Structure formats: structure tokens, C-alpha cells
Design a protein around this ligand. Structure first.
Ligand SMILES: *CCC(=O)Nc1ccc(CN(C(=O)Nc2c(Cl)c(OC)cc(OC)c2Cl)c2cc(Nc3ccc(N4CCN(C)CC4)cc3)ncn2)cc1
Length: 273
């Protein structure tokens, strides 16, 4: 792997809007189980006040493709822009040292685990659940407005911060049970196919981290979905919210709600409470 083995220095372009002082950063201990590279928790100063951040770097046996993938993710996060309900880029270190990508840390893990850990034998009341859904919908609406199609929206890909804020994660910037039929069939991915996945995420939320389509082998799902199968209402779910889910799972992409509508609908339920 030429670039990494051959170059005693890696001449990435300086981008002053994002470059971050290496001596204002302090690397701590691994974050997660690194299914997505070596990711480390860290403290970052003057973002003279410290704050906890996450830092991604190359694994010490990274290939040139690993380098390209990290750089690609980096560049994509630059263009997306800031929103409260997504994991934001906070900075980069590219000049005169190892490549570091600095981003928001979510201390409480992903949304699926968060819910499962707090299952009753309350903490996960109707308002808390609607609020989770609402936040994600706001995140997706923002992403949509930036012309970004997620393609893998699921509770396992939503992260929870210290203050219980939902932040959409995206490990695909460089599964089947969450894919719209048109994506399963023709590898067509749209905002409306994200809406389908959001419906599945909604079901995930109200079953408190339940696994979609229980007892159904992934190979059977397409004929099942073609023949019109849909998941049933979760016990913790008002008919009206289930109605939303089912609209997200409309066969025709045009008959699924938009994320703007999902935000407004979920917002109204929140006020009502
Ligand atoms: C295979 C299981 C696994 O290892 N999952 C896992 C998920 C998330 C992380 C680390 N985070 C992360 O990668 N963020 C990130 C990065 Cl580095 C980039 O870089 C390009 C892009 C994007 O999206 C654009 C994102 Cl999100 C991460 C984690 C956290 N907090 C956090 C803490 C703990 C856990 N956790 C603990 C225990 N289990 C079992 C699962 C998960 C998850 C997340 N905040 C921010 N980013 C690493 C591994």
C-alpha cells in the first residue's frame, strides 16, 4: 500500500476552516468496538474550556483504501453542515502528523441499546419515545434539505448524547429489514426510501429496541413485503402513531409522508402531551 508505506509525510491539503491544533487535543480510550475503524474518545480545548469529543484515526495497519475512505468521510462531513440532531464534524488534524478526524461524542451509545437497557420488567414513557422519534425526524429533514440520502437509517445508527439528544450517525459516507422494497429490488435509494426506514425505526422505538420482523429469515422478506406483509402495532403504541408507521411503509414512495410532515405530526403529538 504505496502512499502509507512510501510517504514519510502525508501531504494532505490544508483547509483552514477545519484544521484543529493538535496540542489542544488529548486522546483517551477506545470508543465502541471499532466495527468502523479505530475510534477514540478525547478531550478538546477551546472549541480555554474543554469538551469531550470522538476522534477517528487510521488503524496501525491501514491500507491506502482505508486512508481514502477516512479522507472521503471527512470531506463529506465538511459539506453537510451543522445540525443538532446529527453527529457533526468538529475539526481535523491533517498538517504535520497522523490524520485525525474530530467529531461529536455521544456518551450513551446507540438508540437501540439505550432503549433495551431501560426496558421495564416510566423511564421510557410515551413522551420520551415520541421525543426520540421527533428528534430523528428533525435530523432526517435537515439531511434531506442538504440533499443527503442516508440509506441505512436504523436505531443502531442513532446515537444518544449525555443529555439524551438524538444524533444520527452515518457509517456509510465513504440492513435488509430496514430497506424499502424499491431499494431491495432495484437498489433505488431515495429520500422516500429513507422514510420507509424511518417507519422501521419508529417501530424499533416503540418496541423499546425490538428486532424487526421477528422469526422471519432475511431471504424471505422480499416476497413477504411484495405480498403485502407489514409489522403489527407494538403494545406501547397508540393507533395514531401506528398509523404513521404504516404510512411510512406504503408500497408507492409518493404515498409515504415526507420528513417535513413527519416532523410536524410528531411535534403536534408532543404539544398535546
Ligand atoms: C460493531 C459494533 C460497533 O463497534 N459500533 C460502534 C458505533 C459507533 C462507534 C463510534 N462512533 C463513531 O464512529 N462516530 C462517527 C465517526 Cl468516527 C465518523 O467518522 C467518519 C462518522 C460518523 O457519522 C458521520 C460517526 Cl457517528 C461514535 C460513538 C459515540 N458514542 C458511543 C459510545 C459508545 C457506543 N457503544 C458502546 C457499546 N456498544 C455495544 C455499542 C456502542 C457507541 C457510541 N459517539 C460518537 N461517535 C464505534 C462503534
Amino acid at each position: 500500500d504505496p502512499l502509507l508505506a512510501g510517504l514519510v509525510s502525508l501531504d494532505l491539503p490544508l483547509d483552514p476552516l477545519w484544521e484543529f491544533p493538535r496540542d489542544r487535543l488529548v486522546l483517551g480510550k477506545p470508543l465502541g468496538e471499532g466495527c468502523f475503524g479505530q475510534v477514540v474518545r478525547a478531550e478538546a480545548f477551546g472549541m480555554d474550556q474543554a469538551s469531550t469529543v470522538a476522534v477517528k484515526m487510521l488503524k496501525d495497519n491501514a491500507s491506502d483504501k482505508d486512508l481514502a475512505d477516512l479522507v472521503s468521510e471527512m470531506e463529506v462531513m465538511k459539506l453537510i453542515g451543522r445540525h443538532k440532531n446529527i453527529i457533526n464534524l468538529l475539526g481535523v488534524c491533517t498538517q504535520e502528523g497522523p490524520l485525525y478526524v474530530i467529531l461529536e461524542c455521544a456518551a450513551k451509545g446507540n438508540l437501540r441499546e439505550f432503549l433495551r437497557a431501560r426496558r421495564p420488567p416510566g423511564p421510557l414513557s410515551f413522551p420520551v419515545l415520541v421525543s426520540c422519534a421527533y428528534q430523528v425526524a428533525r435530523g432526517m429533514q435537515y439531511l434531506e434539505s442538504r440533499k443527503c440520502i442516508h440509506r441505512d437509517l436504523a436505531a443502531r445508527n442513532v446515537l444518544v448524547t449525555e443529555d439524551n439528544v438524538m444524533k444520527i450517525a452515518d457509517f456509510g459516507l465513504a440492513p435488509v429489514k430496514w430497506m424499502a422494497p424499491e431499494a431491495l429490488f432495484d437498489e433505488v435509494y431515495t429520500h422516500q426510501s429513507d422514510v420507509w426506514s424511518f417507519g422501521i425505526l419508529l417501530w424499533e422505538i416503540f418496541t423499546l429496541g425490538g428486532s424487526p420482523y421477528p422469526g422471519i429469515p432475511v431471504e424471505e422478506l422480499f416476497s413477504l413485503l411484495r405480498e403485502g406483509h407489514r409489522m403489527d402495532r407494538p403494545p406501547h403504541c397508540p393507533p395514531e402513531l401506528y398509523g404513521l408507521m404504516r404510512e411510512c411503509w406504503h408500497a408507492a414512495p409518493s404515498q409515504r409522508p415526507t420528513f417535513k410532515q413527519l416532523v410536524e405530526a410528531l411535534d403536534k403529538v408532543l404539544l398535546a402531551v
